[PDB]
Amino acid sequence: AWDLKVKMLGGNDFLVSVTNSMTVSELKKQIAQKIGVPAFQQRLAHQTAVLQDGLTLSSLGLGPSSTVMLVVQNSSEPLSILVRNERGHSNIYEVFLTQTVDTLKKKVSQREQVHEDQFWLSFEGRPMEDKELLGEYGLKPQCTVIKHL
């Protein structure tokens, strides 16, 4: 393991312990532990190129000498998820990970003609709480959220 310099735009610089085979996705998690920015609010760039979460640091030509930029996003960007209901059908919903679980239940509510208090949502077996942000449950593009009656 070796250390990498991270510079936050309009922010502080700092280092993180990293590996060559480590992914940008894991790096963001290291950054979150260091400065508390949730991974889903982090956009990383190296030399004006925005980094894809699946890329490995070595594949990107990173070493102890490199420096990566961090841009923190107050409001995040849209992604699609699947919400599979009691009937077993999955429909596409659009969310921002910085939105609350609540905004999603309201979308489900309006669209599927049900009251918010008549169902609840889970992701990977974990129940989703109305006031928490969707990102905190590790939602990713086309992941499946389950709707329970």
148 in the same domain as 131: yes
Assign residue 41 the CATH number of its domain.
Answer: 3.10.20.90
C-beta of residue 4 within 8 angstroms of C-beta of residue 62? yes
121 in the same domain as 65: no
Q: Cα–Cα distance between 78 and 64 in angstroms, integer?
A: 33
11 in the same domain as 23: yes
Q: What is each CA distance from 69 to 44, 48, 89, in whole angstroms?
A: 6, 9, 41
- The bridge status of strand 67-72 relative to strand 2-8 is parallel
Q: Cα–Cα distance between 52 and 101 in angstroms, integer?
A: 26
Q: Cα–Cα distance between 71 and 25 in angstroms, integer?
A: 15
Contact partners, residue 131, CB within 8 Å, separation at least 6: 100, 101, 102
Structural domain range at position 143: 75-149
63 in the same domain as 116: no
How many domains would you assign to the chain? 2
Point out residues after which the chain has a gap (C–N over 2.5 Å): none
138 in the same domain as 119: yes
- Among 47, 74, 101, the domain boundary falls at 74
- Among 20, 42, 74, the domain boundary falls at 74
Q: Is 90 exposed, middle or buried (0-12, 13-18, 19+ CB in 10 A)?
A: middle
66 in the same domain as 92: no
SS in 3 state form for 73-130?
CCCCCEEEEEEECCCCCEEEEEEECCCEHHHHHHHHHHHCCCCHHHCEEEECCEECCC
Distance of alpha carbon 81 from the chain centroid: 12
C-beta of residue 145 within 8 angstroms of C-beta of residue 126? no
Rg of the chain taking only CA atoms, in angstroms: 18
82 in the same domain as 60: no
Q: What is each CA distance from 119 to 71, 126, 130, in whole angstroms?
A: 36, 14, 11
Contact partners, residue 26, CB within 8 Å, separation at least 6: none
